[PDB]
From Swiss-Prot, chain A:
Accessory subunit of the mitochondrial membrane respiratory chain NADH dehydrogenase (Complex I), that is believed not to be involved in catalysis. Complex I functions in the transfer of electrons from NADH to the respiratory chain. The immediate electron acceptor for the enzyme is believed to be ubiquinone. Belongs to the complex I NDUFB5 subunit family. The chain holds residues 127 to 189 of 189 of the full protein. It is found in: Mitochondrion inner membrane. This is NADH dehydrogenase [ubiquinone] 1 beta subcomplex subunit 5, mitochondrial. It comes from the Eukaryota.
From Swiss-Prot, chain B:
Residues 18-44 are annotated as: Disordered. This is NADH dehydrogenase [ubiquinone] 1 alpha subcomplex subunit 8. Contains four C-X9-C motifs that are predicted to form a helix-coil-helix structure, permitting the formation of intramolecular disulfide bonds. Belongs to the complex I NDUFA8 subunit family. The gene is NDUFA8. Residues 31-44 have a biased composition (Basic and acidic residues). Accessory subunit of the mitochondrial membrane respiratory chain NADH dehydrogenase (Complex I), that is believed not to be involved in catalysis. Complex I functions in the transfer of electrons from NADH to the respiratory chain. The immediate electron acceptor for the enzyme is believed to be ubiquinone. Complex I is composed of 45 different subunits. The lineage of its organism: Eukaryota, Metazoa, Chordata, Craniata, Vertebrata.
């Protein structure tokens, strides 16, 4: 292969690897925030479903 | 003139006229916490794959 093909093949390799590296650093930062704040789709630990509640008038009034 | 109600009458659910306004917040609930932002948009393939160490897919 000539130097030009290897040179520009290297640039294509570097671009992919640089893009993956930035995404890897971004994922770690995103995970740290989500786990700290709980405001994301990850680390979403379930709470009790409120459709289970019965809203009918009960046997007694105060409830 | 009193007529004894028949079997089953006193267990009916009835409707009553009232001027007392319907209570707005009978449980005295605080304002509910805001839900988390929805995730929306089209699902696209992961950029450069799993990106797990050396794997290219
Ligand atoms: C019997 C043969 C059966 C296969 C023929 C079936 C024909 C029908 C399928 C049609 C078809 O041909 O297309 C599918 C496929 C070609 O698909 P393609 O879209 O045309 O081009 C793919 C590119 O070549 C490559 O494109 P890519 O790089 O974008 O995608 C590949 C990518 C993602 O793909 C994968 O993850 C799968 C990787 C293996 C696929 C190779 C074919 C599998 C069948 C052969 C298995 C032989 C095992 C050898 C045993 C060695 C003794 C221990 O690779 C990785 O990222 C993983 C890195 C390697 C993992 C190493 C993990 C370390 C521990 C294991 C080390 C052990 C030594 C290596 C041997 C184990 C195999 C890696 O068939 C092939 O010709 C395979 C060619 C080899 C590609 C390997 C990629 C480079 C990694 C080199 C690893 C060294 C082993 C290479 C083995 C090659 C032996 C021939």
């Amino acid at each position: 292969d000539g130097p030009e093909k290897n040179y520009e093949r290297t640039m294509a390799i570097l671009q992919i690897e640089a893009e993956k590296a930035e995404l890897r650093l971004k994922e770690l930062e995103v995970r740290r925030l989500m786990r700290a704040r709980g405001d994301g789709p990850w680390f979403h630990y379930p709470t009790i479903d409120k459709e289970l509640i019965d809203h009918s008038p009960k046997a007694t009034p105060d409830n | 003139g009193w007529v004894r109600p028949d079997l089953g009458d006193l267990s009916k659910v009835t409707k009553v006229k009232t001027d007392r306004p319907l209570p707005e917040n009978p449980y005295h609930s605080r304002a509910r916490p805001e839900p988390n932002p929805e995730v929306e948009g089209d699902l696209k393939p992961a950029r450069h794959g799993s990106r797990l160490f050396f794997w290219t897919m």
